[PDB]
Design a protein around this ligand. Sequence first.
Ligand SMILES: Nc1ncnc2c1ncn2[C@@H]1O[C@H](COP(=O)(O)OP(=O)(O)OC[C@H]2O[C@H](O)[C@H](O)[C@@H]2O)[C@@H](O)[C@H]1O
Ligand SMILES: O=c1c(O)c(-c2ccc(O)c(O)c2)oc2cc(O)cc(O)c12
Ligand SMILES: [Zn+2]
Length: 282
Amino acid sequence: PFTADKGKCGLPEIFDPPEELERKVWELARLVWQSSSVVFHTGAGISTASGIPDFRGPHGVWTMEERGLAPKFDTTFESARPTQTHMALVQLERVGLLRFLVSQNVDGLHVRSGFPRDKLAELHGNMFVEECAKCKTQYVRDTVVGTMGLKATGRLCTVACRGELRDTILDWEDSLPDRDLALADEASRNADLSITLGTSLQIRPSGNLPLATKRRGGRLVIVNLQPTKHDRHADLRIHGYVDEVMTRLMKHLGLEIPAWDGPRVLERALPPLPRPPTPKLE
Ligand SMILES: Nc1ncnc2c1ncn2[C@@H]1O[C@H](COP(=O)(O)OP(=O)(O)OC[C@H]2O[C@H](O)[C@H](O)[C@@H]2O)[C@@H](O)[C@H]1O
Ligand SMILES: O=c1c(O)c(-c2ccc(O)c(O)c2)oc2cc(O)cc(O)c12
Ligand SMILES: [Zn+2]
């Protein structure tokens, strides 16, 4: 834990100049239009624009620690709002353009945005989620569960059980929840398009799931300000802020980014909404 390898921290950021950024986001649109099964992979980069620092960015938690400085939070977890990127992903699922969403984020924003939990793998856990050690029932709380490392929180299960509730935050030693990783793995293998957003892809095996898409000739898009572990495997690398990339993508797809109603939990995806007809792609 104290000597846990925190990987490559504080690499220089890359900014695609505007003409190139505009051309890459057009190519991403073309890829989304052409794909049968689109899977998104998110990391801490999608939450930096809500005030939650990442881990390995220039002011990330691990980067600052290396330099003997502290990360800065501009929000609590409870007062953090979903970004434009978070809400774009909600809409993409609703119109059937996203098959599944794999996140390394513990910040609870995908759940709180109203993204359906049955299309989400939360590989590293959720700050707001406790789980019955007996029956495995999960409770999505309105405040952060005050423990980390799969510890007893002190609350008990209420299923019609009295099982001990534990946090879902993996420590360095803990392996990924089997359900989340198994669904994330099946989605990534069966996808013909994996898109990574604000992850450096340094964690194994979370960071490696997008590569599974390349099996049977799937395509891989990496959107990130820094270099990533798997840059050389990407069909398309977009170096720009994920909110800029996603608002431009949504405009190309003719989709609006929906309103956030405040924190709301959706267990099961709703029936798909209508979406714009597809352009002719030669
Ligand atoms: N607004 C932004 N737009 C685009 N890219 C961004 C933005 N902000 C940050 N980035 C990029 O976002 C990337 C975020 O990379 P990392 O900080 O490694 O986070 P992870 O989610 O992959 O960390 C994985 C696990 O490691 C930890 O131990 C935990 O257990 C994590 O769950 C950077 O490369 C930024 O350049
Ligand atoms: O529990 C914690 C936590 O999860 C995170 C964290 C950091 C960056 C992220 O991008 C993120 O999603 C979470 O930081 C912390 C920093 C502390 O001083 C104390 C904590 O207890 C946490
Ligand atoms: Zn129980």
